[PDB]
Symmetry: C3
């Protein structure tokens, strides 16, 4: 269950690949710069959160497709809603870094 | 076509935000509360760590609520095919949102009560 | 206040159902209680105390959403006879990242604290 999903998300969508490399990249940047623990955590928790949400949205997209092939207005709403949840996570993480980084 | 997809899903997301605000009423109310909290945190005299924690905590609520709205949208969709509905998934979704708000409340209280006397 | 009690009730019904049905959620429940007690016990600043709790809270949030997704699939697969756990896999991956995030948070904070 755990690892099975992580791989499929990495093989299929760049939206997870781009954030995936970002997560690794963010951790490196956080550890290199001399900041306090709270700042170190907030920078990686933000980027990892986007990955967390992206995985959940990817689960939503998977269910919608399994049910039917009809272009229904409710199922289409679901994939859009989940897509918005990731957007906020991206926005939140971007806002997070900018606020914290502006010191440096 | 990677550059093209950047605006593709941007359209989906923006359409999702519109869809949430119009249909979901709980998203409307929390958004009011959240947007207020964000502005307050943006004008509060606090450190960057405190400022982020104040904004992120209420932002998560919006993120969770959106996922709950997506989940409910699937249950409501499936409700077309099958007559009976436990509502067990929707209850879990509501639970998740609750914990988010609880977290946001606890985060704010702890951060303020320390920052303040 | 007309409908907000109903919403909260739904949230309670879900929490109680998750506590009984899923024993993994039971483990995460104590983890939050632990995090709260540990953070309040140890002499730490507000920002650190929040991050310790918020991490474990985040896991619990994701687990509830994951359990909600699984509850959807378990309704579908029961009647469709179609059994492809693409959703339960991605859903479980999302929880794992929450776990990892909590561990790193607890590591990074406590390592700089001591
Ligand atoms: C350094 C701090 C800021 C960066 C780190 C935090 C943000 C996540 C990383 C990259 C954003 C670009 C990659 C994602 C591109 C869009 C993905 C997308 O739209 O995915 C479809 C849908 O929105 C969901 O399923």
């Amino acid at each position: 269950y755990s690892w099975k999903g992580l791989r499929a998300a990495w093989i299929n969508e760049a939206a997870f690949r781009q954030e995936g490399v970002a997560v690794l990249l963010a951790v490196v940047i956080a550890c290199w710069l001399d900041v306090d623990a709270c700042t170190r955590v907030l920078l990686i928790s933000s980027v990892m959160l986007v990955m967390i949400v992206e995985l959940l949205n990817s689960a939503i997209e998977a269910v919608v497709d399994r049910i039917g092939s009809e272009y229904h207005e409710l199922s289409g709403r679901a994939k859009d809603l989940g897509s918005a949840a990731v957007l906020i996570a991206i926005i939140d993480a971007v806002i997070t870094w900018c606020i914290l980084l502006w010191s440096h």
